Amino acid sequence: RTLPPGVSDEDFTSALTAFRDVVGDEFVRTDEAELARFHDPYPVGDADAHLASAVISPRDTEQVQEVVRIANRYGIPLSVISTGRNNGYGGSAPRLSGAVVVNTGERMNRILEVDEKLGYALLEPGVTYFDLHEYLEAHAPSLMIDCPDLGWGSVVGNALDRGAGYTPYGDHFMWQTGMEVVLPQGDVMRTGMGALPGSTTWQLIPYGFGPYPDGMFTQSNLGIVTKMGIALMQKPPASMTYQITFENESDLEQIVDIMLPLRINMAPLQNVPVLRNIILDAAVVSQRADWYDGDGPLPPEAIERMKKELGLGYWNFYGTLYGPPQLIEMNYGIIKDAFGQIPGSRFQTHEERHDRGAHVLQDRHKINNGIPSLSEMKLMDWIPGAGHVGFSPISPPVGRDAMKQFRMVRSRADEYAKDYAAQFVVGLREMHHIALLLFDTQDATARNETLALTRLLIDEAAAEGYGEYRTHNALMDQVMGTYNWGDGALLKFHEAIKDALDPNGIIAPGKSGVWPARYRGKGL
Amino acid sequence: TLPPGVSDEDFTSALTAFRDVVGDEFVRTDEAELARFHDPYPVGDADAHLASAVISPRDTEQVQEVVRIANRYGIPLSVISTGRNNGYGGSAPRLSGAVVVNTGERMNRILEVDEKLGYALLEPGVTYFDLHEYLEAHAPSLMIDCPDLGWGSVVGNALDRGAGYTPYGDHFMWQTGMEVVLPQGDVMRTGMGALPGSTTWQLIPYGFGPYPDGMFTQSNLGIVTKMGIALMQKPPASMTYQITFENESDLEQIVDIMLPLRINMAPLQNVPVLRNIILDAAVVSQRADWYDGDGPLPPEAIERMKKELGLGYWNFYGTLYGPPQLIEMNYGIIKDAFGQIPGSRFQTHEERHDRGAHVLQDRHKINNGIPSLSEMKLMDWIPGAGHVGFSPISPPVGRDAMKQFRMVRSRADEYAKDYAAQFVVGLREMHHIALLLFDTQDATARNETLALTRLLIDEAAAEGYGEYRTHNALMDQVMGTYNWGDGALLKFHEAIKDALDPNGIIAPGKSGVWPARYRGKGL
Ligand SMILES: Cc1cc2nc3c(=O)[nH]c(=O)nc-3n(C[C@H](O)[C@H](O)[C@H](O)COP(=O)(O)OP(=O)(O)OC[C@H]3O[C@@H](n4cnc5c(N)ncnc54)[C@H](O)[C@@H]3O)c2cc1C
């Protein structure tokens, strides 16, 4: 029977009774079958590495406060999910093996308010991108969401891991405006203009008076968020999504050097531009066995056959334009003239391409217009038992940097028998190299290779000045370990704050490599 | 002047230890040298906020050592960059008696500008003028975002979450990475700068775990020694325009037309401002020129102000950016929308140039990142004129603007203070920025101004309008309005302050956050 680390069987028994006393017997789950459902679907070490001793589903903020006070009395570590779809990063599994999961989304799933004219929502953690989309379509249709690739996730949960989508509102944390958060001893506070009783401005300026705290509750174990505002973009009168195929893997250098100047003023590249490699593109519409059934990495001719058969390039650029059709045509004209400088470049609009090769173009057209999709999950049919882990370091948006990363990562992936399926994304002045490391979750050796590969990718990226932005449970200590300027000054700052707000070491111990005193230097 | 809590023995032992670190010239204890760090616009008592000394560290290592000395002897340390926080206490400490750490005197270098990626890494003493002058010479494709006055700190203004009026108007938003000395002397870099050998410190504001930079703004949790800022690309062309609105009551329609044109960042591309007659009369004239009588300005003078200077009651200023054809299209939309208001008159920076055009021409500068000091003319409105900021946040809704206009000017009249005010829409929030002008040399004027501002803050709060930035004298009251859940936000701030600052050293009472040794002792 899974016990939290540092808690007696007796104290665990007492805590479970006390948790039932608050939420209801139905909303305290300890059965193996219910716990298996909170397994990381894509484990990278074993699979037994990150387990839940129980799952607690509180009704409301008041119950969140009382379960936190119960956790403090008995020393129960509690991890936190909204919808727990953090796939690539641990799913709903706790960093600290044996933690009790607080499932905020199961019962706290309400859209609390939507203001059409001032363009915001006040949300609970269980609101999915699908939910909010449905609500806006029915009640505030001038507005649109910003969704990541999948959209079964939480508008709150994603923003709290500082996730992103691809509309002009792609930076989810940026557009987060106000929070209600239960602090680690069970106090509740509202951030920004929400701290003023009867304020009408909670969701329209992120800051308020005095120190601005919301960031400290993102990629964080300093609190359980119970309500979160997010600004919502107005739908433009029209939109158009385009694909640019590029023949040569060596085109990346020129593609990135043209992309930056076109994106840094947020026009003409109006949304978040993505450059996807042939694999990430082929894997939505095809399986690995279709191109190659031998051992070792995919050979060049397998790649070449994907390019030809699907009508794609090694690099496939996807962008959306917004506004009156006269502006779209004009901006698209600047785009075509700029990227057309690259020999072999081919341009296709969402209304010009409707074949196997255009599946991603059509899916990008939905996502870039805030229409949530599960199409990218077909990527997990690439190989049997496929799972993925995320690798997404930050770089300067310069071709030389891109080329360096492309080469470093692919070379290592080839060595570790993992396909190079990646994309380069430019936000405004920063670049992300997002590689989806795919592997057989059911094959212990493949799990071990993926973990070994990712640890190597992180160290080598970091030696080059490229820091990881978001990572898996299994990798959090190592990633925080790379941010060790001032003999680990950042982590010492985080620990000082954690130990002050959380003297009993309760909330999601080890999140972002931040351990409270009672668990740190115990190797878990 | 001694710091509260400290014996003279400990003070002199620290002053000595300060001297060993920074050198004799950069520890100032003369009442002549201290006089220049006085709040120039004191509210209530003019002796309420005094410095016991001013220390100018050379570098991060010296800031750290002076912080360690402070911790040894229990010396409170307040902090400036350029200390031009005029309307908010200037370079005067919240805790009377504190030793001011003057980061800007010697730490004044532009450390790095990247033209292609559009950022600077700055030390605190870099002024808007400095950075403008640097860019024109070495990175001319780039422009600063500056506030109304250029003599302030790019860093210090960002750390109080100050603003300008270009698309980069939210200075904290564009702040990207910082190096901070924590209250006990440890130094740390935020975001990507926490990775040694990082090439992306100024390219993304957030690093890997919890995002901390916000907690160093309107804050006493540390001394910033380096700050990054994103820098906007100069568009190919620009033009600034002025819409004059005849009626007081037009405010409601102006704000309701303003919001839908600003929320998408077009056609209102920059931060739109709506200044009242007094605000842009007070630049280019003195109150004496219009009324010598007693009590409030009667309606006749506002009118003679309007007619003599060709201004409205409400004066809209905006800038448009891009190729001329985009400028003209955007200007056509703005004319078509605000032109629905009768008495609407539209003029560009190219087609006015008269005495009443002084503010339009100054906005053309500020909105194109040319800094200026022309708005200081304002402080000649009356002899010995000072101002205190009042700037609550409201929904950008005409009804809310009219309620705020009425309730602020009614109380301003009662307390014998002119209504000189701006409505500003950021993106989906409105600021009511009132400049309460008073005779700094008159104890009654100073007392009345404090009384007026206290009442304005309480009535604003009762209406659901919170203050965003305020004077030393008002910080306790303003934090007290943010008291959701029995003072939960201040209790959180106190727990963090006590954890990072166990000896209660850095800028005690900033934003109403007092460390344990000083809390609830009435200053
Ligand atoms: C093929 C593929 C594509 C993907 N594409 C994207 C993409 O485009 N963009 C993207 O951002 N992600 C992407 N992901 C990752 C993932 O699908 C999303 O980020 C997803 O939205 C995150 O899960 P969630 O929304 O359920 O959040 P959750 O799992 O509920 O929460 C995320 C984390 O936030 C914290 N947390 C959650 N709720 C609370 C709370 N109430 N209080 C405090 N802390 C809390 C915890 O640290 C938790 O682990 C992708 C994954 C895969 C496999």
Ligand SMILES: Cc1cc2nc3c(=O)[nH]c(=O)nc-3n(C[C@H](O)[C@H](O)[C@H](O)COP(=O)(O)OP(=O)(O)OC[C@H]3O[C@@H](n4cnc5c(N)ncnc54)[C@H](O)[C@@H]3O)c2cc1C
């Ligand atoms: C007529 C008039 C018009 C104005 N217009 C504007 C305007 O348009 N926009 C605007 O934003 N302001 C405006 N102001 C207010 C003020 O002039 C500016 O905000 C000015 O830039 C702030 O002073 P400073 O830059 O010297 O900052 P400083 O006074 O150096 O610092 C400001 C505050 O930040 C903190 N701080 C400073 N340095 C550090 C450090 N190194 N570490 C930690 N904390 C630190 C302290 O709390 C300090 O009091 C106006 C004032 C007047 C009188």
Ligand SMILES: COc1cc(CCCO)cc(OC)c1O
């Ligand atoms: C924007 O952030 C992410 C994007 C993807 C898309 C992967 C290629 O489609 C996956 C992630 O994590 C696994 C992300 O965090």
Ligand SMILES: COc1cc(CCCO)cc(OC)c1O
């Ligand atoms: C945008 O923020 C401010 C603007 C002004 C200009 C006032 C009218 O021109 C003064 C301030 O402080 C007194 C501000 O904070």
